[PDB]
Design a protein around this motif. Structure first.
Motif, PDB file in Angstrom:
ATOM      1  N   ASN A 175       0.811  -1.219   0.000  1.00 46.76           N
ATOM      2  CA  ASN A 175       0.000   0.000   0.000  1.00 46.76           C
ATOM      3  C   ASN A 175       0.844   1.268   0.000  1.00 46.76           C
ATOM      4  OD1 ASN A 175      -2.660  -1.116   0.030  1.00 46.76           O
ATOM      5  ND2 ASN A 175      -2.338  -1.660   2.183  1.00 46.76           N
ATOM      6  N   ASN A 193      -5.752   1.577   2.078  1.00 50.25           N
ATOM      7  CA  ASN A 193      -6.454   1.838   3.335  1.00 50.25           C
ATOM      8  C   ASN A 193      -6.285   3.287   3.761  1.00 50.25           C
ATOM      9  OD1 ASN A 193      -6.992  -0.975   3.458  1.00 50.25           O
ATOM     10  ND2 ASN A 193      -4.996  -1.311   4.437  1.00 50.25           N
ATOM     11  N   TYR A 195      -5.440   4.829   6.539  1.00 54.44           N
ATOM     12  CA  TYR A 195      -4.428   5.309   7.489  1.00 54.44           C
ATOM     13  C   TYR A 195      -3.126   5.723   6.817  1.00 54.44           C
ATOM     14  CZ  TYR A 195      -3.248   0.368   7.198  1.00 54.44           C
ATOM     15  OH  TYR A 195      -2.940  -0.881   6.754  1.00 54.44           O
ATOM     16  N   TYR A 196      -2.776   5.114   5.688  1.00 52.15           N
ATOM     17  CA  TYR A 196      -1.555   5.499   4.967  1.00 52.15           C
ATOM     18  C   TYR A 196      -1.615   6.958   4.579  1.00 52.15           C
ATOM     19  CZ  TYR A 196      -0.744   0.536   4.490  1.00 52.15           C
ATOM     20  OH  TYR A 196      -0.576  -0.809   4.733  1.00 52.15           O
TER      21      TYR A 196
HETATM   22 FE   LIG Z   1      -1.233  -1.867   6.155  1.00 54.97          FE
END
Ligand SMILES: [Fe+3]
Length: 307
Positions: A175, A193, A195-196
Motif C-alpha cells: 500500500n 487503506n 491510514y496510509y
Molecule cells: Fe497496512
C-alpha cells in the motif's frame, strides 16, 4: 498488573497501555505478535493461559475463541459505548469492537477530481481505468475486500472484479508503494487503506500532497471497514483488572489515546481524531459477516483464478 496478547499495531497498543497505566497505576505487559498465531496460542493454552486480555486489529479473530468458550463476558454498558449503527457486536457479549480502518480510493487531485471517481469500487476494474488504477493483491485488506465482494455480490462478481484488475490495474507490492506511485504521478488512483494517507498528511502536511481520498460510501463493498477490538480471557485469574482495561479502551480517555497514536476511526461518537478523520457514521460502511479461515481460503482461490 495485566498481560495483554497484542495483535494490533505496536504503536497503538503501547499508547493505550501507557494511558491505562497512567490513569490507573495498573501495569500492562504486551505480548505482541500476529493475531492468528496469538489466537491459536490462546486456544492451546486454554485454562493455563497467562493472557488477561487479547487486543486485536481484527474482531473476526475472536469468533473462534468465543465459540471455543475461551472469552469472558464484558459489561453490556461498556459494549454500548461503541455500539454505533453498523458496528459488529459479539452475540455472546464476550468481545468489543473499538475502532476501524477503511478501504479508500486515493487519487492525484492534480489529474482527477471527484467527477472522475466511481459510485462503486466495482467500477474501477473497467477499461476507463486501464493503466490507471493501482491495487495491492498481496495485501491483507485487499483480501478482506474480496471476501466482502463474494459475500455481498457473489463469487462471479468478485472474480469479474479481480479479472478486471488484472486487465486494467497496475500491481503494487505494498500500500505504501501504491500511495507513493499516486503522489509521484505514476498512476492517477489506487485502492489502499485510509491510514496510509492520513499518516502521510500528518507528517508532510496536506498542502504538500498531490493525493486526496475518495470514499464511495452508500454501503458499497468499497466502503468496507475492518474493526479492531478487545476481549477478556475466561481463563484470566485477574478478571477485575482485565475488565477495567477493556472498559478503559471503550472510555473517552482510552479512545482518545488510541486515535492520537493511530489513524483509526474511533467508535465512540464524542471522540475526534487528531488525524482529521471523518466520523465513523459518515463512512456508510456495509455490514459484512466476520471473515473465517474458510472465507480467506476461498478468496485466495479467486485471486489465483483471476491470474
Ligand atoms: Fe497496512
Amino acid at each position: 498488573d495485566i498481560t495483554v496478547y497484542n495483535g494490533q499495531h505496536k504503536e497503538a497498543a503501547t499508547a493505550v497501555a501507557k494511558a491505562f497505566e497512567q490513569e490507573t497505576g495498573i501495569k500492562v505487559t504486551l505480548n505482541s505478535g500476529k493475531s492468528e498465531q496469538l489466537a491459536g496460542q490462546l486456544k492451546e493454552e486454554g485454562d493455563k493461559t497467562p493472557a488477561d486480555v487479547f487486543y486485536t486489529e481484527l474482531t473476526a479473530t475472536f469468533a473462534d475463541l468465543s465459540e471455543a468458550g475461551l472469552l469472558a463476558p464484558i459489561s453490556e454498558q461498556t459494549i454500548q459505548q461503541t455500539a454505533q449503527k453498523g458496528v459488529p457486536l459479539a452475540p455472546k457479549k464476550d468481545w468489543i469492537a473499538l475502532s476501524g480502518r477503511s478501504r479508500v480510493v486515493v487519487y492525484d487531485h492534480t489529474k482527477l477530481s471527484e467527477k472522475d471517481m466511481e459510485k462503486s469500487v466495482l467500477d474501477y476494474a473497467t477499461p476507463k481505468w486501464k493503466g490507471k488504477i493501482g491495487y495491492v493483491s498481496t495485501s491483507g485488506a485487499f483480501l478482506e475486500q474480496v471476501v466482502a465482494l463474494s459475500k455481498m455480490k457473489g463469487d462471479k462478481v468478485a472474480l469479474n472484479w479481480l479479472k478486471g484488475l488484472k486487465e486494467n490495474g497496475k500491481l503494487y507490492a505494498k500500500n505504501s508503494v501504491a500511495l507513493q506511485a499516486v503522489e509521484n504521478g505514476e498512476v492517477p488512483a489506487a485502492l489502499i487503506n485510509n491510514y496510509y494517507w492520513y499518516n502521510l498528511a500528518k507528517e508532510k502536511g496536506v498542502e504538500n500532497l498531490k493525493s486526496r481520498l475518495y470514499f464511495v460510501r452508500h454501503q458499497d463493498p468499497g466502503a468496507l471497514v475492518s474493526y479492531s477490538g478487545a476481549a477478556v480471557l475466561k481463563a484470566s485469574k485477574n478478571q477485575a483488572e482485565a475488565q477495567k482495561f477493556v472498559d478503559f479502551l471503550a472510555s473517552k480517555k482510552g479512545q482518545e489515546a488510541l486515535v492520537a497514536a493511530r489513524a483509526e476511526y474511533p467508535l465512540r461518537a464524542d471522540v475526534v481524531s487528531p488525524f482529521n478523520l471523518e466520523p465513523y457514521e459518515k463512512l456508510e460502511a456495509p455490514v459484512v459477516s466476520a471473515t473465517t479461515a474458510q472465507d480467506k481460503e476461498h478468496a485466495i482461490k479467486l485471486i489465483e483464478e483471476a491470474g
